[PDB]
Design an enzyme around this catalytic site. Structure first.
Site, PDB file in Angstrom:
ATOM      1  N   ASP A  44      13.583 -34.840 105.571  1.00  0.00           N
ATOM      2  CA  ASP A  44      13.408 -34.489 106.984  1.00  0.00           C
ATOM      3  C   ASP A  44      12.588 -33.226 107.231  1.00  0.00           C
ATOM      4  O   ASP A  44      12.432 -32.802 108.377  1.00  0.00           O
ATOM      5  CB  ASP A  44      14.763 -34.339 107.692  1.00  0.00           C
ATOM      6  CG  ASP A  44      15.401 -35.674 108.031  1.00  0.00           C
ATOM      7  OD1 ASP A  44      14.661 -36.613 108.393  1.00  0.00           O
ATOM      8  OD2 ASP A  44      16.643 -35.777 107.952  1.00  0.00           O
ATOM      9  N   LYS A  70       7.134 -33.392 104.617  1.00  0.00           N
ATOM     10  CA  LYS A  70       6.158 -33.480 103.541  1.00  0.00           C
ATOM     11  C   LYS A  70       5.145 -34.530 103.975  1.00  0.00           C
ATOM     12  O   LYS A  70       3.933 -34.311 103.916  1.00  0.00           O
ATOM     13  CB  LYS A  70       6.831 -33.930 102.240  1.00  0.00           C
ATOM     14  CG  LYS A  70       7.937 -33.009 101.743  1.00  0.00           C
ATOM     15  CD  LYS A  70       8.612 -33.586 100.504  1.00  0.00           C
ATOM     16  CE  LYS A  70       9.300 -34.909 100.814  1.00  0.00           C
ATOM     17  NZ  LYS A  70      10.351 -34.748 101.857  1.00  0.00           N
ATOM     18  N   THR A  71       5.662 -35.668 104.429  1.00  0.00           N
ATOM     19  CA  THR A  71       4.834 -36.778 104.882  1.00  0.00           C
ATOM     20  C   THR A  71       4.103 -36.434 106.178  1.00  0.00           C
ATOM     21  O   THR A  71       2.952 -36.831 106.374  1.00  0.00           O
ATOM     22  CB  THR A  71       5.690 -38.042 105.119  1.00  0.00           C
ATOM     23  OG1 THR A  71       6.579 -38.232 104.012  1.00  0.00           O
ATOM     24  CG2 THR A  71       4.799 -39.272 105.255  1.00  0.00           C
ATOM     25  N   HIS A 107      13.825 -35.484  97.453  1.00  0.00           N
ATOM     26  CA  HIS A 107      15.215 -35.914  97.388  1.00  0.00           C
ATOM     27  C   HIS A 107      15.816 -35.772  95.992  1.00  0.00           C
ATOM     28  O   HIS A 107      15.154 -36.032  94.986  1.00  0.00           O
ATOM     29  CB  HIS A 107      15.314 -37.364  97.868  1.00  0.00           C
ATOM     30  CG  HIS A 107      14.571 -37.623  99.144  1.00  0.00           C
ATOM     31  ND1 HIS A 107      13.193 -37.603  99.219  1.00  0.00           N
ATOM     32  CD2 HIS A 107      15.011 -37.868 100.400  1.00  0.00           C
ATOM     33  CE1 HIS A 107      12.819 -37.823 100.466  1.00  0.00           C
ATOM     34  NE2 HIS A 107      13.903 -37.987 101.204  1.00  0.00           N
TER      35      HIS A 107
HETATM   36  N1  LIG Z   1       9.520 -29.733 114.838  1.00  0.00           N
HETATM   37  C1  LIG Z   1       9.058 -30.212 113.633  1.00  0.00           C
HETATM   38  N2  LIG Z   1       9.546 -31.364 113.154  1.00  0.00           N
HETATM   39  C2  LIG Z   1       9.116 -31.894 111.965  1.00  0.00           C
HETATM   40  C3  LIG Z   1       8.116 -31.224 111.212  1.00  0.00           C
HETATM   41  N3  LIG Z   1       7.837 -32.000 110.130  1.00  0.00           N
HETATM   42  C4  LIG Z   1       8.558 -33.090 110.181  1.00  0.00           C
HETATM   43  N4  LIG Z   1       9.389 -33.066 111.280  1.00  0.00           N
HETATM   44  C5  LIG Z   1      10.299 -34.129 111.783  1.00  0.00           C
HETATM   45  O1  LIG Z   1      11.129 -34.633 110.692  1.00  0.00           O
HETATM   46  C6  LIG Z   1      11.060 -36.081 110.684  1.00  0.00           C
HETATM   47  C7  LIG Z   1      10.811 -36.642 109.271  1.00  0.00           C
HETATM   48  O2  LIG Z   1       9.538 -36.162 108.817  1.00  0.00           O
HETATM   49  P1  LIG Z   1       9.023 -36.662 107.366  1.00  0.00           P
HETATM   50  O3  LIG Z   1       7.638 -36.148 107.396  1.00  0.00           O
HETATM   51  O4  LIG Z   1       9.321 -38.245 107.280  1.00  0.00           O
HETATM   52  O5  LIG Z   1       9.877 -35.985 106.164  1.00  0.00           O
HETATM   53  P2  LIG Z   1      10.132 -36.379 104.616  1.00  0.00           P
HETATM   54  O6  LIG Z   1       9.388 -37.825 104.494  1.00  0.00           O
HETATM   55  O7  LIG Z   1      11.555 -36.188 104.211  1.00  0.00           O
HETATM   56  O8  LIG Z   1       8.859 -35.574 104.098  1.00  0.00           O
HETATM   57  C8  LIG Z   1       9.997 -36.606 111.694  1.00  0.00           C
HETATM   58  O9  LIG Z   1      10.666 -37.382 112.697  1.00  0.00           O
HETATM   59  C9  LIG Z   1       9.429 -35.299 112.334  1.00  0.00           C
HETATM   60  O10 LIG Z   1       9.683 -35.279 113.762  1.00  0.00           O
HETATM   61  C10 LIG Z   1       7.615 -29.972 111.721  1.00  0.00           C
HETATM   62  O11 LIG Z   1       6.783 -29.338 111.096  1.00  0.00           O
HETATM   63  N5  LIG Z   1       8.085 -29.510 112.938  1.00  0.00           N
END
Ligand SMILES: Nc1nc2c(ncn2[C@@H]2O[C@H](COP(=O)(O)OP(=O)(O)O)[C@@H](O)[C@H]2O)c(=O)[nH]1
Ligand SMILES: *C(=O)[C@@H](N)Cc1ccccc1
Lengths: 85, 383, 205, 82
Positions: free
Chosen positions: B21, B24-25, B75
């Site tokens: 969350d 990264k993506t 993770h």
């Molecule tokens: N406010 C904010 N939210 C973020 C940011 N990066 C990711 N998120 C939130 O976190 C969620 C998951 O992001 P994701 O990129 O899938 O994370 P990961 O795949 O665990 O790398 C998305 O719904 C984004 O809204 C950021 O830099 N700022």
RNA sequence: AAUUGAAGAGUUUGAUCAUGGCUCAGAUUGAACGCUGGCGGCAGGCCUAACACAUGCAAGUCGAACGGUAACAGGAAGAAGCUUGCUUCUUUGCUGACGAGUGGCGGACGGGUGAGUAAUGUCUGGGAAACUGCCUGAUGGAGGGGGAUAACUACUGGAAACGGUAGCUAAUACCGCAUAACGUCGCAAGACCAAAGAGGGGGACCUUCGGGCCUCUUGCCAUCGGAUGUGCCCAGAUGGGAUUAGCUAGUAGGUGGGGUAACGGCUCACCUAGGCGACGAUCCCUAGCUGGUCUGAGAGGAUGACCAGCCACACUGGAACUGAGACACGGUCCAGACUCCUACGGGAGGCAGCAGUGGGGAAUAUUGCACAAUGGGCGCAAGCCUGAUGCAGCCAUGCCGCGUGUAUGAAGAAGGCCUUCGGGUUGUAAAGUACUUUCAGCGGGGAGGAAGGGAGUAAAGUUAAUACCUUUGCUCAUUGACGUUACCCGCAGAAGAAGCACCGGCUAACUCCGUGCCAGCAGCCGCGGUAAUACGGAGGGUGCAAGCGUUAAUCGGAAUUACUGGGCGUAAAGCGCACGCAGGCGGUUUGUUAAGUCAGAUGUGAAAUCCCCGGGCUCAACCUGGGAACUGCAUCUGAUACUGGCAA
RNA sequence: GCCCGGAUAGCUCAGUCGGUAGAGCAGGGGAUUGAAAAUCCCCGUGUCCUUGGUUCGAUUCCGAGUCCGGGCACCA
């Protein structure tokens, strides 16, 4: 298909429209002479053949008709006009 | 497939590491979006990368170099993919949420890459659009600095780049401003690494693919050596050591002609199936390393508070061994006199593995077991 | 394809000499001959007829250095000719070039003569031949390549043949170190101590 | 329209041409009418190296059989006058 | 010169001799498995899923057909820099050439597969009711006019695919007019039907200044031909099952109309009621056929990969169009299944063509190079296309050739092994020593596959012509994928190169030790129950050799399907007996016929393969000249013993 | 790559919700015999796949990994 010889598609089909149109007109004249035989007018039947003679003969030299079938119509129909007359 | 790839831009393999969350993506798709307006060969979509469980490898490039980004899983349950994800690092990017601060797991992400040797890190303190109070951003930043300081890294000299991957992906210039300067930090803090091209050829087998209609396309970044399309190169794995020949190589679906160290390419072999090759093997030069079933090493075990173990195990203990891509476990024959190996020991042990693979002296490797990294070391003896 | 082993062990099997070890000396005299084909060689065989048919073939085949598959083809050609199928096998086995040079004395032994041919040393009719199985034609002259003449192997070799019979189906010069092949070999002109009759009956089955 | 061509026989790297009389629409080494003479380009400097029966050619030329330029060259190569 | 060619053993019983099944000894294959593995030469290499397929590639070409030229290279007019001709350069189809378009030709060949097919096919030999582009022989003509369109402009639908509307213009495109014949219809008289022009060169003449005109070449139309191909009909042959015995109704045939290149139930209308069937119909199953290959003494049996001829299919099914020819692999229209693209209205696609892939399966390889040679298409030619073909790479899959060395060497060693512990055996084997060097490795020379083609030039013809053009010599620079080639020379060192099944009998060849009806071997008879030549190990030995064995398969042995060439009193087998149709066989005399039959001739029996004699690669494998053979069929002409038909 | 089912003495399984692992079919060791059967006299041969942790204590608690089978992917 994706070949430069797809020309033969549109070109030969353009040839299809032309040749098909000429084939029906040749036949309808023969329908006239057959109606002439059923009409019983041996003079008019002779006259019926009078318009179709230069028709199939001009189709013979063009290779449109196999030339053998061309003379074949001129055979039996002649046999028809002498059968009545 | 087609499109001959150009060998003009220097290629430095990078990648965003972080936590669930965090973003990264989100940052991955955003960087290419930012690099999209400087070069029309980017803008990797969010649905293009996809949480990212697989070691997704997309790319972006500045008008100076070329980069091979990796979007690894931040993770804990996906540590093995993260280990092989760290198998192509020339420099990394740490994604830390300024909302929940640096997580102990995000702390764990730093140490795993360290035992395998990550050279540089460009920590992108994420989730900046959540808070505009700079001193709160400072404590989260300094904690990351504290984290790298106690983890043998220049925490005092680590490039901290603030920013939010969220709006950066939406195209908001202010948050995209951080991404542009992010690339500024990537080309300066990370120089051109070592690529021993004149060394005997070695390529770690990381992933196995089968393009329907072309054959087998195994991949990985070459550690050393040069290969050419048509050259016979053999494969050493947990199975019987086999051989094949090069029939092609396309990078990012773009054609390449010569395989060389540094480039994470996808080489095409001579008609082998999927049931023969698997992750963990090694594509190398004809007759370089032969497998063994008996070997010794010099390993160190750390503490559990840091991440290792807390209790001393015994003889017969069977942990997994990792040398850059291998996950071979094995029966351990402890040295006489040492029945219990406490966390902090720097002893040797005789290993009798279960699947024979490349065993050669001077092999720097790590050891894991049960879900945690027990330690690291170097294979000095091969029996 | 060659034997590449002990040249007297197989000869001790038969009891009869095969000339594999002629050399500069006349006869060996020290190999424990005729009563030692091997370990339990002292006990005389049951000598079944099937074995004696094999015993003549294996004896004669080792004389020419030809092997089974190839020896069978000599037989195949032997049956499709005329005259005597038994004597067809003899002329063809003598037809090999290594055999004719053996009678000339240019080679002490056949094994020696085989490499002599194989190392471009022999130049028949001005044509170098490496093939020992070259079918020699009638009325021809065999010779030796000048670079490969008087190379110490042929020096002691020629003086050995003086005690040999030197057949009448060919003639050596030894003045210019050349060999002229005469008419085709007769049955009476050869040793005639072997029984080739059983061989044609061997391949009958 | 039939013609007098060359049916390339012989093994790999060592051919042997057999001048034939075949149909134009058929294969090289396939169906034909008759074969007349041959052609040995890799023959030794000896007695025979090229043979061809001039009369059978003329009989077929009489009806209208064309000759290949390479084959017609053999006619000059066999030298009708020499 | 041309088939000079045929083996048996074990096992039923206490023993024997028969009958009789079973098994092995042989060779081979489009092979596979296991083990081992040096090279070269010539072949072969998805047999199963006719299962599904990414990408690239596999069929284009002619300006000597036409309007044109969006581009590339020049000329030419011009224009701008400025070295005033050194450059820059906007127009221009006037040229060389030329995408896209029209049109002519090819695309029906080459190539691949064997699903279907039991007779529509194929093979063999005849036959007549036909057609036949490109090529070629013979004989004439090649006269004169007209109306549209693509490309291109303007606008515009649709994401794309792919179109729509109104106008522009040419032709070897299309359509007339004229002239017609040994051409077509008809008994004849008569009636009727064709076409197209360009290119090169040039004197007089002529030039609305495009050009005519003359000549050469080529192309165009029709007709009788021929060569070749194709289509069609009949006869014989071309598998198993009778536990498949009745089948068929456009079906058997006729008359008439139509259709087909041509004949016909090919199809219709009426009429007749028949046709096929035991020398086997229909039905069911299986399967491409043959030339041939393997086996076999032969006869037969098995089989139909590769090379070759033929047929059928082209995602499934179906129909048709163009054209000389398809009822079509890289064409079309329709439905269906399976994939793909999508802006969801609607479209795109077919590897059983080279490679290549997933999967199936015991198992069969490279997304190579090049058009140098042969062949094919268009073209005057030059050239261009050519996954045909020519070569290369992988694989011991096959056959053939060769190498891993030769000579010498007895303390007749060490060690292993056996032992009557004497010794024997390994064993000239090794070390030692004197030499050689193929192929591998490396370095230099160097064939042949190449004939031609382009430019120049002389002569001979053509013609008004020394020109154009055509032909034959000659001269110049030459066209080679393979290819660091074949082959040869040279350098270094025995240097880099031997394994595998088996050893009781059948079947060439042994002991010891260890395990004790346990474990295992095994083709069959059988071995092992504490002294195994059969299990396992060691030594020794045998067979074969870059192959050696296992396994599967076909034939041989099998005279255990007996035609050559078997049997039935008891071993497997005389219907319980009898009558009798079809069928088979049939005394003797004469005549006659000449069907069977025999001899001879003729056509055919394709080529390659198999056989004989020769030739070329160092030999062979392999390639190859000629002859022979192709044991059969058809027709003609004779013969009359035997069989058959007719007559007494 | 991911998620589960069997991994319990020769074979198939019971036994768990922390407390020193069973039965059946087996099979085998001995007396009798030329040798077995019948007869009689005796019977458990187990790393609970392995390894580690919360431990007075784990087959049973949470887990990794390896082996095998069964479902989903991913597509340089
Ligand atoms: N406010 C904010 N939210 C973020 C940011 N990066 C990711 N998120 C939130 O976190 C969620 C998951 O992001 P994701 O990129 O899938 O994370 P990961 O795949 O665990 O790398 C998305 O719904 C984004 O809204 C950021 O830099 N700022
Ligand atoms: C293929 O595109 C490789 N060059 C890069 C890659 C992408 C994803 C996973 C592994 C390799």
């Amino acid at each position: 298909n994706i070949k430069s010889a797809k020309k033969r598609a549109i070109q030969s089909e353009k040839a299809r429209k032309h040749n098909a149109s000429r084939r029906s007109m040749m036949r309808t004249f023969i329908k006239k002479v057959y109606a002439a035989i059923e009409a019983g007018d041996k003079a008019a039947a002779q006259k019926a053949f009078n318009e179709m003679q230069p028709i199939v003969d001009r189709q013979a030299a063009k290779g449109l008709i196999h030339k053998n079938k061309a003379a074949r119509h001129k055979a039996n129909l002649t046999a028809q006009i002498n059968k009545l007359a | 497939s087609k499109e001959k790839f150009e060998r003009t831009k220097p290629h430095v393999n990078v990648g965003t590491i972080g936590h669930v969350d965090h973003g990264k993506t989100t940052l991955t798709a955003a960087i290419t979006t930012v690099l999209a307006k400087t070069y029309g060969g980017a803008a990797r979509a969010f649905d293009q990368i996809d949480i990212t469980i697989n070691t997704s490898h997309v790319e972006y490039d500045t008008p100076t170099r070329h980069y091979a980004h990796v979007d690894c899983p931040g993770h804990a349950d996906y540590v093995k993919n993260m280990i092989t994800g760290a198998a192509q690092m020339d420099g990394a990017i740490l994604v830390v949420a300024a909302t929940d601060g640096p997580m102990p797991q995000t702390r764990e992400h730093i140490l795993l890459g360290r035992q395998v040797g990550v050279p540089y890190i460009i920590v992108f303190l994420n989730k900046c659009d959540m808070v505009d109070d700079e001193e709160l951003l400072e404590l989260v930043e300094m904690e990351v600095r504290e984290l790298l300081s106690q983890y043998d890294f220049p925490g005092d000299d680590t490039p901290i780049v603030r920013g939010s991957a969220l709006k950066a992906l939406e195209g908001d210039a202010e948050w995209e401003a951080k991404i542009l300067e992010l690339a500024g930090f990537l080309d300066s803090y990370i120089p051109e690494p070592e690529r021993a091209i004149d060394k005997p050829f070695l390529l770690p087998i990381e992933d196995v693919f089968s393009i329907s209609g072309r054959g087998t396309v195994v991949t990985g970044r070459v550690e050393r050596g040069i290969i050419k399309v048509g050259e016979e190169v053999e494969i050493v794995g947990i199975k019987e050591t086999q051989k094949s020949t090069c029939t092609g190589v396309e990078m990012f679906r773009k054609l390449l002609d010569e395989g060389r160290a540094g480039e994470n390419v996808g080489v095409l072999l001579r008609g082998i199936k999927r049931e023969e090759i698997e992750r963990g093997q090694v594509l190398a030069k004809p007759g370089t390393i032969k497998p063994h079933t008996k070997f010794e090493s010099e390993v160190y075990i750390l503490s559990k508070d840091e991440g290792g173990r807390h209790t001393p195990f015994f003889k017969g203990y069977r942990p997994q061994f990792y040398f850059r891509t291998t996950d071979v476990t094995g029966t351990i024959e402890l040295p006489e006199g040492v029945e219990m190996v406490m966390p902090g020991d720097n002893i040797k042990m005789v290993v009798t593995l279960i699947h024979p693979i490349a065993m050669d002296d001077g092999l720097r490797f790590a050891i894991r077991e049960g879900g945690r990294t027990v330690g690291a070391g170097v294979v000095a003896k091969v029996l | 394809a060659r034997y590449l082993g002990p040249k007297l062990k197989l000869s001790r099997r038969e009891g009869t000499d095969l000339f594999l070890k002629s050399g500069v000396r006349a006869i060996d005299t020290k190999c424990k001959i005729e009563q030692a084909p091997g370990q339990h060689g002292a006990r005389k065989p049951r000598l079944s007829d099937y074995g004696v048919q094999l015993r003549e073939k294996q004896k004669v085949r080792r004389i020419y250095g030809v092997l089974e598959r190839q020896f069978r083809n000599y037989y195949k050609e032997a049956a499709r000719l005329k005259g005597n199928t038994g004597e067809n096998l003899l002329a063809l086995l003598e037809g090999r070039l290594d055999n004719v040079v053996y009678r000339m004395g240019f080679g002490a032994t056949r094994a020696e003569a085989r490499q002599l041919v194989s190392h471009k040393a022999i130049m028949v009719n001005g044509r170098v031949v490496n093939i020992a199985s070259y079918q020699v034609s009638p009325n021809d002259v065999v010779s030796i390549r000048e670079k490969a003449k008087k190379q110490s192997r042929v020096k002691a070799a020629l003086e050995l043949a003086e005690q040999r019979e030197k057949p009448t189906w060919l003639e050596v010069d030894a003045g210019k170190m050349e060999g002229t092949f005469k008419r085709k070999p007769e049955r009476s002109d050869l040793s005639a101590d072997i029984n080739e009759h059983l061989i044609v009956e061997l391949y009958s089955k | 329209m039939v013609t007098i061509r060359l049916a390339r026989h012989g093994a790999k790297k060592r051919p042997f041409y057999q001048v034939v009389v075949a149909d134009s629409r058929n294969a090289r080494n396939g169906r034909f009418i008759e074969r007349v003479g041959f052609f040995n380009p890799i023959a030794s400097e000896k007695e025979e190296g090229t043979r061809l029966d001039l009369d059978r050619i003329a009989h077929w030329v009489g009806q209208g059989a064309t000759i290949s330029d390479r084959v017609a060259a053999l006619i000059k190569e066999v030298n009708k006058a020499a």
